[PDB]
Design a binder for this molecule. Sequence first.
Ligand SMILES: CC[C@]1(c2cccc(-c3c(F)cncc3OC)c2)C2=C(Nc3n[nH]cc31)[C@H](F)C(C)(C)C[C@H]2O
Lengths: 341, 16
Amino acid sequence: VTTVVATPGQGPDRPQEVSYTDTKVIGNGSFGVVYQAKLCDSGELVAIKKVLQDKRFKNRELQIMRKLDHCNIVRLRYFFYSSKDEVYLNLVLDYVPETVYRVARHYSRQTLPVIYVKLYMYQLFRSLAYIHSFGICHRDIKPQNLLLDPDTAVLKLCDFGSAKQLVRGEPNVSYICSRYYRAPELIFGATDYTSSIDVWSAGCVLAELLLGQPIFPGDSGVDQLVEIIKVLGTPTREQIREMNPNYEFKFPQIKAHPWTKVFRPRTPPEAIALCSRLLEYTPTARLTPLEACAHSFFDELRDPNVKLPNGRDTPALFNFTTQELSSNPPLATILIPPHAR
Amino acid sequence: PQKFAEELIHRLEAVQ
Ligand SMILES: CC[C@]1(c2cccc(-c3c(F)cncc3OC)c2)C2=C(Nc3n[nH]cc31)[C@H](F)C(C)(C)C[C@H]2O
């Protein structure tokens, strides 16, 4: 049994003794270590991210997660410090048994039923609308960071280790996101990008779930843009200017592949329409996450008599808060169905 | 900025 003095993720700084056991290393990398463990008083499994923390400043990931409380974001239960002589921050997270990456991989070996594509994407856009309302850009949207509870079909966004509150005028690094999900303005080297890069990445996830494989499987930075161009066609000079004005060059003119021919023969037209409004070259032309939630692709989720394939009721889908609606409050006319009032 | 565009133009013609 390991006992630490841990501070709850929510509320004021009120540290308390927390004991946990059965710690196993699940992942490793440059970020640090991710452990699985069990809380003794409750028996619940948790996940622990261990990163080295300097004592002279606050951990950016920690400060972001402490302001988040949302059904579709992984909860920070506790954080505590531990250890030659270095001090590590440990983030104690809720444990969700599955990720989107693993579930999609099974179908990549057939296609995920579209009811689940609606369910998972809807919750992802909800989580994006929530964090974007704080000015926070996740910057690592990809299937591996989408936790799933298969029993309840609840999705939870995690890994805020790349996240940042984007502030106008402060440039940011362009080499962000996993390659398959990187927005084209990032590939062009734009440093003044906005939270709309998350919407691009979310568009790639949606297309991947419809297609059964990543839509833009680039093998490198430039090749990633080539894969994008081979689907969307060559971006126009105006679209390039919106992404990065420093490209006055002339690129070969590749024709856009017909969107309805990109996906499977019976892909719902609403799904293809949503993809095209997310995977827009011009960053400001993409839907916001809240607009995405209100898209007609998710109308079936607002049906009072909607049936899930697991035989259970749908999770919380319409418990929007003022903070979540702040980018466009009148969208609640669509987002909250009459039976949810 | 000039180096990226050159490689991009090159790779686009192989698919064009
Ligand atoms: C324990 C982490 C996982 C997870 C998945 C993806 C990313 C992170 C992550 C993070 F959450 C915070 N920071 C950095 C991270 O990158 C590694 C964490 C975890 C299980 N489920 C979870 N519940 N809670 C957190 C997770 C899944 F079941 C596995 C065992 C199949 C895969 C496993 O990784």
